[PDB]
Every structure is written in C-alpha cells, then in structure tokens.
Write a protein that holds these residues in place. Sequence first.
Motif, PDB file in Angstrom:
ATOM      1  N   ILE A 141       0.831  -1.198   0.000  1.00 51.40           N
ATOM      2  CA  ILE A 141       0.000   0.000   0.000  1.00 51.40           C
ATOM      3  C   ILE A 141       0.869   1.252   0.000  1.00 51.40           C
ATOM      4  CG2 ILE A 141      -1.952  -1.175   1.059  1.00 51.40           C
ATOM      5  CD1 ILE A 141      -1.068   0.115   3.733  1.00 51.40           C
ATOM      6  N   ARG A 142       2.007   1.212   0.696  1.00 53.15           N
ATOM      7  CA  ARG A 142       2.909   2.359   0.696  1.00 53.15           C
ATOM      8  C   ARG A 142       3.505   2.603  -0.681  1.00 53.15           C
ATOM      9  NH1 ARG A 142       5.514   4.114   5.225  1.00 53.15           N
ATOM     10  NH2 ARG A 142       5.352   2.004   6.098  1.00 53.15           N
ATOM     11  N   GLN A 143       3.848   1.536  -1.402  1.00 54.90           N
ATOM     12  CA  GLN A 143       4.524   1.687  -2.687  1.00 54.90           C
ATOM     13  C   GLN A 143       3.556   1.985  -3.832  1.00 54.90           C
ATOM     14  OE1 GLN A 143       8.302   0.051  -3.433  1.00 54.90           O
ATOM     15  NE2 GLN A 143       7.958  -1.744  -2.128  1.00 54.90           N
ATOM     16  N   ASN A 144       2.407   1.311  -3.861  1.00 55.12           N
ATOM     17  CA  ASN A 144       1.559   1.284  -5.045  1.00 55.12           C
ATOM     18  C   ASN A 144       0.271   2.091  -4.908  1.00 55.12           C
ATOM     19  OD1 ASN A 144       3.232  -0.413  -6.680  1.00 55.12           O
ATOM     20  ND2 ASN A 144       2.567  -2.174  -5.457  1.00 55.12           N
ATOM     21  N   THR A 145       0.117   2.877  -3.846  1.00 56.97           N
ATOM     22  CA  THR A 145      -1.073   3.710  -3.733  1.00 56.97           C
ATOM     23  C   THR A 145      -1.022   4.837  -4.765  1.00 56.97           C
ATOM     24  OG1 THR A 145      -2.463   4.975  -2.202  1.00 56.97           O
ATOM     25  CG2 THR A 145      -0.072   5.235  -1.990  1.00 56.97           C
TER      26      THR A 145
ATOM     27  N   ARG B   2       9.980  -9.904 -16.804  1.00 49.45           N
ATOM     28  CA  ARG B   2      10.936  -9.137 -17.616  1.00 49.45           C
ATOM     29  C   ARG B   2      11.829  -8.336 -16.669  1.00 49.45           C
ATOM     30  N   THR B   3      11.979  -7.008 -16.857  1.00 48.47           N
ATOM     31  CA  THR B   3      12.925  -6.157 -16.153  1.00 48.47           C
ATOM     32  C   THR B   3      12.233  -5.349 -15.061  1.00 48.47           C
ATOM     33  OG1 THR B   3      12.622  -4.436 -17.830  1.00 48.47           O
ATOM     34  CG2 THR B   3      14.452  -5.973 -18.132  1.00 48.47           C
ATOM     35  N   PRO B   4      12.963  -4.991 -14.008  1.00 45.40           N
ATOM     36  CA  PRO B   4      12.384  -4.182 -12.933  1.00 45.40           C
ATOM     37  C   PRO B   4      12.033  -2.790 -13.423  1.00 45.40           C
ATOM     38  CG  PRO B   4      14.321  -5.327 -12.155  1.00 45.40           C
ATOM     39  CD  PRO B   4      14.293  -5.508 -13.643  1.00 45.40           C
ATOM     40  N   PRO B   5      11.080  -2.127 -12.778  1.00 42.91           N
ATOM     41  CA  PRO B   5      10.787  -0.731 -13.104  1.00 42.91           C
ATOM     42  C   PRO B   5      11.748   0.224 -12.411  1.00 42.91           C
ATOM     43  CG  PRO B   5       9.312  -1.453 -11.386  1.00 42.91           C
ATOM     44  CD  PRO B   5      10.205  -2.635 -11.705  1.00 42.91           C
ATOM     45  N   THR B   6      11.700   1.481 -12.854  1.00 45.96           N
ATOM     46  CA  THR B   6      12.498   2.549 -12.266  1.00 45.96           C
ATOM     47  C   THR B   6      11.710   3.336 -11.219  1.00 45.96           C
ATOM     48  OG1 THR B   6      13.499   2.663 -14.459  1.00 45.96           O
ATOM     49  CG2 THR B   6      14.216   4.289 -12.875  1.00 45.96           C
ATOM     50  N   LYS B   7      10.797   2.668 -10.508  1.00 44.01           N
ATOM     51  CA  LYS B   7       9.992   3.340  -9.495  1.00 44.01           C
ATOM     52  C   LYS B   7      10.837   3.885  -8.352  1.00 44.01           C
ATOM     53  CE  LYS B   7       5.314   2.790  -7.718  1.00 44.01           C
ATOM     54  NZ  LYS B   7       4.935   3.822  -8.722  1.00 44.01           N
ATOM     55  N   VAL B   8      11.984   3.271  -8.074  1.00 48.14           N
ATOM     56  CA  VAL B   8      12.895   3.729  -7.033  1.00 48.14           C
ATOM     57  C   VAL B   8      14.280   3.884  -7.648  1.00 48.14           C
ATOM     58  CG1 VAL B   8      13.413   1.390  -6.230  1.00 48.14           C
ATOM     59  CG2 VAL B   8      13.790   3.347  -4.714  1.00 48.14           C
ATOM     60  N   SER B   9      14.941   4.995  -7.345  1.00 48.53           N
ATOM     61  CA  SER B   9      16.268   5.289  -7.862  1.00 48.53           C
ATOM     62  C   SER B   9      17.300   5.243  -6.741  1.00 48.53           C
ATOM     63  CB  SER B   9      16.295   6.659  -8.543  1.00 48.53           C
ATOM     64  OG  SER B   9      15.246   6.780  -9.488  1.00 48.53           O
ATOM     65  N   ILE B  10      18.574   5.313  -7.137  1.00 49.88           N
ATOM     66  CA  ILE B  10      19.656   5.344  -6.157  1.00 49.88           C
ATOM     67  C   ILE B  10      19.582   6.613  -5.321  1.00 49.88           C
ATOM     68  CG2 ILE B  10      22.148   5.164  -5.849  1.00 49.88           C
ATOM     69  CD1 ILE B  10      20.665   2.682  -6.969  1.00 49.88           C
ATOM     70  N   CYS B  56      15.775  -1.180   7.662  1.00 55.67           N
ATOM     71  CA  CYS B  56      16.962  -0.463   7.203  1.00 55.67           C
ATOM     72  C   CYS B  56      16.961  -0.211   5.707  1.00 55.67           C
ATOM     73  CB  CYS B  56      18.225  -1.227   7.601  1.00 55.67           C
ATOM     74  SG  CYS B  56      18.607  -1.152   9.364  1.00 55.67           S
ATOM     75  N   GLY B  57      15.898  -0.561   4.989  1.00 49.50           N
ATOM     76  CA  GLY B  57      15.817  -0.297   3.570  1.00 49.50           C
ATOM     77  C   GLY B  57      16.231  -1.436   2.667  1.00 49.50           C
ATOM     78  N   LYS B  58      16.359  -2.656   3.196  1.00 43.67           N
ATOM     79  CA  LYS B  58      16.781  -3.784   2.370  1.00 43.67           C
ATOM     80  C   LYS B  58      15.818  -4.015   1.212  1.00 43.67           C
ATOM     81  CE  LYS B  58      16.904  -6.397   6.039  1.00 43.67           C
ATOM     82  NZ  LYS B  58      16.982  -5.389   7.130  1.00 43.67           N
ATOM     83  N   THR B  59      14.512  -3.947   1.480  1.00 45.81           N
ATOM     84  CA  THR B  59      13.533  -4.128   0.413  1.00 45.81           C
ATOM     85  C   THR B  59      13.657  -3.033  -0.640  1.00 45.81           C
ATOM     86  OG1 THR B  59      12.095  -4.979   2.164  1.00 45.81           O
ATOM     87  CG2 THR B  59      11.138  -4.709  -0.031  1.00 45.81           C
ATOM     88  N   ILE B  65      18.773  -1.395  -6.597  1.00 41.46           N
ATOM     89  CA  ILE B  65      19.881  -2.063  -7.272  1.00 41.46           C
ATOM     90  C   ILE B  65      19.400  -2.734  -8.552  1.00 41.46           C
ATOM     91  CG2 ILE B  65      21.579  -3.906  -7.064  1.00 41.46           C
ATOM     92  CD1 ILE B  65      22.307  -1.383  -5.573  1.00 41.46           C
ATOM     93  N   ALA B  66      18.256  -3.421  -8.485  1.00 36.32           N
ATOM     94  CA  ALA B  66      17.727  -4.091  -9.667  1.00 36.32           C
ATOM     95  C   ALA B  66      17.384  -3.092 -10.765  1.00 36.32           C
ATOM     96  CB  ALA B  66      16.500  -4.922  -9.292  1.00 36.32           C
ATOM     97  N   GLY B  67      16.779  -1.961 -10.397  1.00 35.77           N
ATOM     98  CA  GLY B  67      16.464  -0.948 -11.391  1.00 35.77           C
ATOM     99  C   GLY B  67      17.706  -0.337 -12.009  1.00 35.77           C
ATOM    100  N   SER B  68      18.714  -0.052 -11.181  1.00 35.56           N
ATOM    101  CA  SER B  68      19.949   0.535 -11.691  1.00 35.56           C
ATOM    102  C   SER B  68      20.659  -0.421 -12.642  1.00 35.56           C
ATOM    103  CB  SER B  68      20.863   0.920 -10.528  1.00 35.56           C
ATOM    104  OG  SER B  68      22.170   1.222 -10.987  1.00 35.56           O
ATOM    105  N   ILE B  69      20.741  -1.701 -12.273  1.00 35.96           N
ATOM    106  CA  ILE B  69      21.437  -2.667 -13.119  1.00 35.96           C
ATOM    107  C   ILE B  69      20.667  -2.896 -14.414  1.00 35.96           C
ATOM    108  CG2 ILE B  69      22.290  -5.018 -13.263  1.00 35.96           C
ATOM    109  CD1 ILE B  69      22.762  -4.954 -10.278  1.00 35.96           C
TER     110      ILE B  69
END
Lengths: 486, 577, 136, 124
Positions: A141-145, B2-10, B56-59, B65-69
């Motif tokens: 919900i945090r990511q895809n809202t 297929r490939t990850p999206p660029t929803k999150v950047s470095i 700590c942001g692992k997810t 990392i997947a988007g950048s690669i």
Amino acid sequence: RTPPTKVSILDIAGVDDTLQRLLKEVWFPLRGGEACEKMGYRYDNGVLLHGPSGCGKTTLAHAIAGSIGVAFIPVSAPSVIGGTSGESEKNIRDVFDEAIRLAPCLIFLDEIDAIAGRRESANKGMESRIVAEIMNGMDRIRQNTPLGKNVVVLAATNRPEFLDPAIRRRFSVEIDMGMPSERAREQILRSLTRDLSLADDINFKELAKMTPGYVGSDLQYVVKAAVSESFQANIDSLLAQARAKHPADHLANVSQPQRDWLLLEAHRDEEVSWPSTKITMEQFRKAVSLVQPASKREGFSTIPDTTWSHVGALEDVRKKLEMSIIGPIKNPELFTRVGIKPAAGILLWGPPGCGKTLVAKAVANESKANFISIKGPELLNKYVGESERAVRQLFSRAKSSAPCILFFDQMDALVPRRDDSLSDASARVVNTLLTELDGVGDRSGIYVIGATNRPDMIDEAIRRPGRLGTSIYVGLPSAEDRVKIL
Amino acid sequence: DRTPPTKVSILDIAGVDDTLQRLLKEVWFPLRGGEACEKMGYRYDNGVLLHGPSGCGKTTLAHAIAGSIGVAFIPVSAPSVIGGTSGESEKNIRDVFDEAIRLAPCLIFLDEIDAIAGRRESANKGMESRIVAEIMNGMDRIRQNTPLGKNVVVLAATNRPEFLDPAIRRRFSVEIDMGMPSERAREQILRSLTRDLSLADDINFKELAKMTPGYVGSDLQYVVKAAVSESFQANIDSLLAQARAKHPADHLANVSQPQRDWLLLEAHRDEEVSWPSTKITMEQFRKAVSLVQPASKREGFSTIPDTTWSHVGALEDVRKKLEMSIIGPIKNPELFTRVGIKPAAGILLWGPPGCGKTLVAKAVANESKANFISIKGPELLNKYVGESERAVRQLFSRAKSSAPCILFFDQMDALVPRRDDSLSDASARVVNTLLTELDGVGDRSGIYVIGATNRPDMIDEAIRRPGRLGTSIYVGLPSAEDRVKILKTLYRNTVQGTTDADLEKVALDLRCTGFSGADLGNLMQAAAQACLERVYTQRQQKRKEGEIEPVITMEDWEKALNEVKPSVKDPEKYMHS
Amino acid sequence: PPGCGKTLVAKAVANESKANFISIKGPELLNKYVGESERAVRQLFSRAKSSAPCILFFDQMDALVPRRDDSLSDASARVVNTLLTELDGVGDRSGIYVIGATNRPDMIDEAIRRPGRLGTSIYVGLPSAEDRVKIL
Amino acid sequence: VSGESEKNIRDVFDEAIRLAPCLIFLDEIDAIAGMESRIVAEIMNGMDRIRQNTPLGKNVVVLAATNRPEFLDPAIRRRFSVEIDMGMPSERAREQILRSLTRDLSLADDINFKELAKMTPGYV
Ligand SMILES: Nc1ncnc2c1ncn2[C@@H]1O[C@H](COP(=O)(O)OP(=O)(O)OP(=O)(O)O)[C@@H](O)[C@H]1O
Ligand SMILES: Nc1ncnc2c1ncn2[C@@H]1O[C@H](COP(=O)(O)OP(=O)(O)OP(=O)(O)O)[C@@H](O)[C@H]1O
Ligand SMILES: Nc1ncnc2c1ncn2[C@@H]1O[C@H](COP(=O)(O)OP(=O)(O)OP(=O)(O)O)[C@@H](O)[C@H]1O
Ligand SMILES: Nc1ncnc2c1ncn2[C@@H]1O[C@H](COP(=O)(O)OP(=O)(O)OP(=O)(O)O)[C@@H](O)[C@H]1O
C-alpha cells in the motif's frame, strides 16, 4: 461493499488527548488527499492502539471509521484463516488488494496479536507465512497507492508484548489508552447515560470520586445494573399480579424464588408492558456495589467486617493510624496541600496477643478501599521465575487499583534478614521487594501495613522511611486498659 | 516479469555508502562484467545475504539495485510462492529457477528468506522440507547450468540471520550487515527524505542528526511524516475555526471540545478548501522528533524519572563525579575524547540506605536526556532454562543498539551474588552471562551501567575488577552542615513561616545527629503531620466551639523531633567488611 | 595482582617456545549448555594436541574450578573431573602445556594444586617505575 | 544417494562385497546420518552383512569422512573406532591446495605460491 458504522463519537469520551492526536494523525491522510497531491508526497501511516482491555479501542476505531465516512473494512483476527495451506496467505493479499483498489479507505485489523505473534515463539509454518504475508503486503500500500487516495492501517490489541517487533516497527504512532482517571470517568459516565431518563438530582462527581479504578466496560456494567435495579420494582409488581391471578392457596411449597420461576413459566406468551421511571442516585450507589471491578483477579481479599467497636483501649495507636493512613485515604486533598505523599505504611511489632492484627483489620475495614491480604510467605514459589513475578504482579495490581492497603502479615518469613548469605530464593524476593517499595517507579496510592513479632529480624534497609519504617509498639495493656478491653 | 521498473532510484536511498561500495564489487560486476568473467572463465556461484535491523531499507535497496542494473529480475517473496496443492510449491520454485537460468544473466531476490528457510526441527510437516531442499537443489542447478559468460547471483534479505537454517546460511558466503546509521548517515538520509519538501533555510541538519541517536531509516521517515502533519496542522486549525464559526448557535454540543470538532468535521465533509503549501520550520521538526520513537519502544526502556538536580541536596562530590563521567560525555563527546575520557562501561554506587543513591541515579538519568533502562531487581530470571540468560543478552543488545543508553542495575545483590559459598547453582549461568556481556561492551561503544546496593559484601568481587563496574563511588551519611541544604531542598520541593534561618537550628540539634536524607524527609513529614493535627484542634475549638490554615509552625518541628529516631543503626557494619 | 599483564607473561613464554598460543577468556567457555560445556573443554585439548607443540592460557582460573569444599553442583563436578582428566592425559611428551592464571591461589579447586597437575604456583609482580613510564 | 536410497545403498554394498576386494567411501557421511535414520539403519545392517558375509580373504572397508565427528550417531561413533587426525595443514599442503584452487584462473607469472603458504599459518 464496505459501508461505515453508526457508533458516532458521542458514545466515546474521556480520551480527549488521544482523540485529538488521532484526529491530527488520521483525519488528515484521509482528507488531505488534495493537500498531499499538491505536495506530491505519498502519505500513509500505521497507527496502533495498546493498553488495558475494555478501554474502548474496538469502539474507538468504529467511531472514527463512522465519523470519517470513507470505505472501511473490518478485518477480525480469525476471519482471515482458511483451510488449504496457502489460502490464508492469498486471503491476506486479497484483503490488502481490496483496500488498495477501493482507495481511500481505513483498515481495521482487530486483535492483531493473535495472528501476528512473534515468529520465534511460533515456529509452525502457517502463521509464519501469515506474518510474512502481512509484512510483505503492508508495504504494498505504501509503494503502489495512487498518491491522491492513500490508506491508513489501524489495529487494536490488549497486549503488545507478543506482537512482532518487526511488525511493531511498521506501526509508527503508538497510542497508550491508559485506564481512565476521575475526570475521564465522569465524562464516560455522562456519555453512557446520555440517553437515559436519569433523575435531576444525580451527582456525577460523587460517582467519579468513589470510582477508584474502573474501566469503560466496568462503567457500562454499572449502567446496566442500575437499569435492572430501576425495573426490579416493576418485576415485583408483575410477580404479585401473577401470584394473584393464580392463587391456588399456594402453587408450590419448595421455596419462594423457585415458585417465582415456576409462575413465570405459566404465562410466557402473555405479553405485558413495562412502564419506566427515573433512575435514582441511590440506585447508582447500589449498582456500583453490586458490580465488581476489573480488579477482581482473585487478588483482593474480602474486607474484614471488624469496625473500631471491636477493639478496645489502644487510643494512641488508633489516633496515630487515623492520622497516618485513615486521614489521607479519606481526605487526600487536605494531606496533599500540606505536602504529604501517600504514606509508605506502618510496621507493627509487639508480643503476640496484643491485637495488632485486629487493629490492622479494623483500619482496612474503616478505609473503605480495596484491600489485599497475604497470609505469610505464600508468595514464595518453587520455580525461580515466579518467586519475584508474584510480588511484582501484586504491586502492579495494587498500583493499577489505587488506592489500596497492603497487609503483609508476619514479615519474619516473607522477608528474612539478608545480611548473611543464608538462602537463595528468599535473598531475591527481599531484593525485589526493596526495589519495588521505593526504587525507581512511582507507587502513589499504595499503603504497606506489616505485622510481626520479631522486629530485629527484618533487613534494616526496610525499616528506613520511604518503606514501612514508621514502626509502632503495641504491647501489653495497662491495668486500667484491661477494663476497657474486657 | 521481464525487467524491474524505475519506481525507485539510487537517489531515493542514502546512508548506505559503505554497504553500497562493498556491494558494487559483488552484484554490479557479475552482471555487467560478464565478458570479463567469460574471458576470466570463472563461474560465480555465491549468494549475497542482507541482514540487519528491521526497516533499514533492504527491500528498497534491492529494488533500487535491480532498477539501476537493469537485468531481468523476478521478485520472489516467501509467501508469494507457497501453494495449496501438493507439489505446487516445488513446481513454483523449480519453474522460477528454470526461468532465471533461461533468462540469464539475472538477479534473484528472496525477501524474508527466514520465513521459509527457518528451522526444520521445530515443525513436523513434510511440506516445508521439500522447499528447504528445493532451494538447495535449484541453487546447485544454477551452479551447474552456466555458460561462464552469463552468471546468476541470488540475493537474500532478512532481519533475523540466526533464524535461518545454518546449512543454508553456510553457502551464502557474503553476509552484509546494514547496521544502525551513524551521525552523518542520519543527516544524509534526512536530506534525501527532505529532497522534495519546501524547507526554510533556518533548519540545521546537524542538530537533527545530534537529536536522533537510536534511529533507523524508517524512524526518520516517520519523523518527516509527522513533520508534514505538523505543517498542515495550521490549516487544520484554520478550517476548524471557519467550520465552527459557520455553524449557528455558537455552541452546539457541550459534550467535549475534540468530540465537537470531530462532529463539525463530518457536518460538512465536502466543503473542501485550498490547502496552503506552507514551509516546514525547524521548530516543527523539533516538535515531531520528540513524538515518534519506534524501533526502541518494545518495552525495553522505562519512562525517564522527572527528578532534576533541584530534587537533591548536598552530595556535591558524587554529583561532580557523575557529571564528569556520564552526563558530560553524552552531551559533548568530542571534548572528552580529546582529553582521553572514552565512554565508560559505568560505575557502581554503594552505601547505607537513606543516602539517596537511587535518587542520584534517577537525577543522572533525567539530566542525561538519553534512553534509560531500569532493571528492577531480578527481573531477568525465568522459569525456563533458555530464557534467563537470553533476557540478559537481549537487554544488552538493545542497550548497544540505542547508544547512548544508561543501564540501571538497582540492587545487584540479586543479580551478582557472592558465590564464595554454594549459595546458588542455576544462577551461575546468569552471572557468567552478565560478566561476558559486560566485557563485550567496550570503550566508545556508548553504554553506561549504574548499579547500587546496600550491602557491599554481597556483590561478587569480580564486578569491581576494572573493565567491568570497578568505579565504586561511596555515599555515606551526610554531615551536620549537609542536613541544612537537604532540609532546604526538601522544603523547596513541598510548596507562610518558611523561616529558612531556623532550618539549620532544627537540623543541627543534637537529637538530629545520625539521620539520613530519607530520615530528614520523614522528620519533615512528621512535622507536617503535627501541624495538621494542630489544625484539627484549632478548627474544632475556635469554630466548632465558638478556619483552615496549612501553615507550619516552628514548634511543630520540635514536637516531631522527639518522636523521630535515626533509621540506620550501625553504618560501620555497612561500610567496612 | 589483577589481570594487568598476565597475558604478556604467557605470550612471552609462547614466543620464546615458538609454539602455538591459545587463550580462554575465563567465564566464556561456560554457557547455557551443560552437555557441550565439557565438550568445549575436550575440543580445546583435541585441537591443542593436533597443533602440537602448543601452550594453553587460562586467565581468570576461578571461572572454572573454585574451591570444591561443597561438591554440590553436578555440572561443576562434570567440568572439573573432565578437565583434570584431559590435562593429566597429556602433560609429559605431547608438547601441550596449560597455563593457569588467576588473582588468588586459594580460590581454585584443591585437586589441581598437588604435584603432577598444575601445582607450580608462580607469583607475578607489579610493573616497576621504568615500566610505569612506558605504561603512561 | 525413504526406501529407494536405502535400496541404492544395498545395491552398492551387495556388489561391493560380491566384487571383492573393493574400496567404498561415503563423502559427507554426517549430512545423511542424522530418511536419515533409515540410512543409519541401512549402514548398520550393511556393516553387519560385511562382517558376516566376507570371504575372510578379500574384504571391503567402509570408509567415510565427516566435517564434524559430533554430528554422527553415537552408535556409529562407537562402531567407527578408527580415527585419523587431519590437523593443521602443512605449508606444502597449503601451497599445493592453493595451486589446486587456481587451475583455470588467468594468472600472471609473478605468482610465488611458496611465500603465501609461509605467511598463512592460521587458515584452513
Ligand atoms: N472510554 C470509553 N468510553 C465510553 N464507553 C466505553 C469506553 N471504553 C469502553 N466503553 C464501552 O465498552 C463497550 C465496548 O468495549 P470494547 O470491548 O470495545 O473495548 P476495548 O477497549 O476495545 O476492548 P478490547 O481491547 O478487549 O477489544 C461499549 O459499551 C462502550 O461504550
Ligand atoms: N485491643 C484489643 N481489642 C479487642 N480485641 C482484642 C484486643 N487484643 C486482642 N484482642 C482479641 O484477641 C485476639 C487477638 O488476635 P490477633 O490476631 O489480633 O493477635 P495478634 O496479637 O495480632 O497476634 P498474631 O501475631 O498471632 O496475629 C482476637 O480474638 C481479638 O478479638
Ligand atoms: N537508507 C534509506 N534511504 C531511503 N529510505 C530509507 C532508507 N532506510 C529506510 N528507508 C525508508 O524506510 C522504509 C524501509 O522499508 P523496507 O521494507 O525497504 O525496509 P527493510 O530494511 O527491507 O525491512 P524489512 O526487512 O522489514 O522488509 C521505506 O519507507 C524507505 O523509504
Ligand atoms: N540526599 C537526599 N536528598 C534528597 N532527598 C533524599 C536524599 N536522601 C534521601 N532522600 C529521599 O529519600 C528517598 C530515599 O530512597 P532511595 O532509594 O533514593 O535511597 P538510597 O539511600 O539510595 O537507598 P536504596 O536505593 O538502597 O533504597 C529518596 O527517594 C528521596 O525521596
């Protein structure tokens, strides 16, 4: 469909600080969608309510959901578990997907403790993947809202200890809805008796001042008992009419109450109307006595029925105890104004047969407050874990049901002198008792009364003020005192 | 797929500079330097394991990392693959692994791998074992099916490395610990979070970093959420005022203020108004910081006592030592470190009762303005064999995480008994664990331990050895002149004939020789009781036999002095041997 | 005196002997396990025998075998008897020698101090003024 | 190698005793001697059948290696009373196993494995 409820805020009171903070925390994300869209910030939060049971969390959430009026999905703890190994995993996902699709909405995960317990303490796979699925989906919900229509996750438990600290980190705003205070209790009583034909001579302040530690459900039970007390007279009238219509000299000879039950079967289908009447203040005084508080956890012995008329002479000790315990307990404002804390208590000492125990019992009866008796060293247990947890739990109840009078009879065995290394089990209960009496942690409202026949066997760290240190000699009555006592 | 999206950047992630630098030579290289390995002719069959505190942001790190690669990636979660019908779980695992091998090179992320790869001994089902072995056999299938030019690395993240099966943990050769962010890391992550927010230039990020010792990335995310809420709180008040003025009758519901506001909010609902884009001031950040404290609220820290130095009299030497050993280094670590005073392991108070060692500890905890833990006697011992020492280890882990912290072992006699005799045997594993954990906390770690006791002979002499709590500060009976200051302070804590010039006369009386601080408190209480008793006589004679006055008279102190006696009898028994 | 420089004394002997130096930090080998408590002791001697010649360092010797005037703790007896057997087994030619370090000789199990086993009690002195200059 | 692997071990052992002399080795025997209890029972029956069915002049030896002796069954521990200690690896052994790690590695001519082993005392 997920419509709101009809439990509007008028049924909840006494939580003004909590209500306002939850306003600022929850009303905005469900109504600042325009504001968040202008800011372009993905604003969602997880609010968790923890505290004593019966404080109103399950009703506070419903009232908030009704007030907001957006889509709201009641999700109880056990209604999510399915048959096949994986059906529940998909069920949690479906719940969260239904929440995210019909946005904005409020999610209520009632009793989250049961299904989100600690994974180390529950190594069975099924609830493990249930916790993992909740953990995974709660970030969905945090990511895809869709920014403009966020979602807030709300949950309520009576125990946060068994909750996963991993899932606890997700819930940011933790609100501790503690036990209501006197001002809160009066407002709760007014809110509950908002729609009752209550008499105009009622004094809610008199009720609140005599409510030591009740909870919202306790006050609800008070109102319910008062309602039945108001209709006892009409029940009696109906019983008399039923007796009159079918005299037959006497329908039974077994007893009166059983004959009443047998008579009430003889009509059943015969409907009658019950006129109502204003509920009297005396009826409330009776109802509060009939109902038992939430502090009935088998830890408060029945108050002894020994008044001051059962003890003779002993004028000095009676006056001193009246000044030390009876004084503050009956008029706390006067003692607090002078600057006297809730007294630590009294350590009675003297030869056996002098009536110190009777004096303590009389003080307990006169206080008209919750009383706890401990028959000697009954607290000690074979296991090492419980030997101190019993004392800590006893003091937790005493603090939670303040004010209270504590009567540890025969200090001699419960707390021996730990000056030399005699034993190990007692050497720890003494330490935890010293820590609890005046260590870190307030204990206002706790009075500790101890009686013993060997004053020079208790650790000198206990005869110090701040604990039961004000020792009172009680000895053989004089020649003339024998006349009075006889 | 297929490939990850660029929803999150470095740019969306920060504070992991060392972790990202180490990961660069571990995931980036065997996904773009595939030609380098192909010429090298070396298969890369290893699994990068991510572990650390929750949130700590692992997810988010994995997705960034997947988007950048940009290589093909399939998100695999622990509950996302378990199926109902038998064999469907193996079907899912094998098909995902085959798709990964076919679409090579690729990255595989296993979120919450502990939730699947746990312990096979604790559960008796025959359905988890097939999966815990399928992970192994599919991993070996990648180990075999690689053309040495398109190698595949599997990434796994969890918050509990221990809960993993050690057999699986063996072959995740590289374990990366994204520990608690430091001072600079928190400042950087705060800037990254407030990248897209309107901020007044008066904000000092150094102060914000300095005020959040025990915080995680999610902690600061919640802090900035609270800051945004406080920013819009002003428009909330404006809308509330406008709605309240709109409704007639001035007062509608006399039930309560916040409830009335709630009802008025729903009274209109659709009357939306423009929301000003007000700027977030530093004061709003300061307010928001004090509210939101997660990742340390798991009952591990008791409430800070509200006892400042105004609640204690005399005791100047112990106060000086405490300020210069504990209070100081927390506030300004650099100055002490320059002079060679590292964050100490702690100290050990000891003295006869009534001196106020507990009060001194509470005052130090209050003035430190840091996370505080109080251990009320033997609250660590448990009926279960494997919980008593686990409690100590977990407590010290929590103390280490939320540095700086103050550990208050009140009445250590129940925790470190003198084992010269055979006093206890099941608690030896407790004292040994306590000693090991105390030795595990070194200098500059940021953990301080303060202990007090009434019998110095009961505590084990191993504690007083340096490295452990060897700094013993003795607190004794206050002198005659000290009682004057003690009485002054205590009377200042009460609320009129205060007449401070007679406090010395009362305290210096030969009847008041051997009293301790609690004993002076009891004497004051007795004097107040005598005053209140006189109040009854005056009220029942002047008024009943013919007002209210809580003012204490001088003669009341003299009256109470007769009936009060010193508590401690022989301090020489307590101080020597 | 307390453990100020006993490790230096042990390490100097190890360096001159040019053999392996294994040390145990007192109350670390003893954990919540009781079955493996003696197993750790056995494994230490097994590795020392494998890596012969070697020297074994036991600082804070009190943490293992205090005075058994009252032989009540069964785990303590299981530990002391096993440790005595293992150290007595290899003390002459295997090249393994165990170093005992503590603060007081009188808080150690009596069945160790007699000859054959760890009966050589040596008093370590405090550093001198020249040593104190370097320490400062 | 829940009944089929036991049959495979029977196939191995019966032919091993039938085709004598022969050498039998079971690598990482601990990992399958904790299905595994059936494996231990099969090993016990096999060692008994080797004891009783050997031609007394051409026998077969059940050889095994474990990364930890403690993991094995105590009955297997008493039965496996023959021990060989592979202690701290020698400098020549360390150098040669280093070279046995670097077969296909594209390496320069400057490598001198002799000194690495001499400065690698505490590694396995
Ligand atoms: N603070 C309160 N004010 C008014 N009514 C209250 C309050 N607390 C409880 N009640 C009453 O209690 C009843 C419902 O209580 P409920 O069981 O929902 O409480 P709770 O604290 O959410 O309990 P639990 O945590 O066990 O779920 C209603 O009759 C409600 O009016
Ligand atoms: N002052 C007194 N007034 C009235 N009754 C008294 C008095 N002193 C003794 N008694 C009577 O004698 C008995 C005293 O029993 P009690 O339990 O109070 O004894 P105690 O002296 O406190 O000793 P113990 O330590 O055994 O409890 C009771 O039956 C009580 O009625
Ligand atoms: N270094 C960081 N940079 C940016 N955002 C961060 C950072 N650390 C944490 N966050 C924020 O905190 C949250 C972290 O959630 P996430 O699920 O990625 O954490 P995690 O460490 O993988 O935890 P878990 O193991 O419970 O899945 C996100 O909202 C993310 O934006
Ligand atoms: N020097 C003092 N200044 C002010 N108040 C004091 C002083 N000494 C004692 N008191 C008061 O008396 C109480 C004594 O309780 P406290 O636990 O602090 O005593 P202690 O001598 O440290 O012993 P212990 O911790 O072993 O019970 C304090 O809480 C405080 O209210």
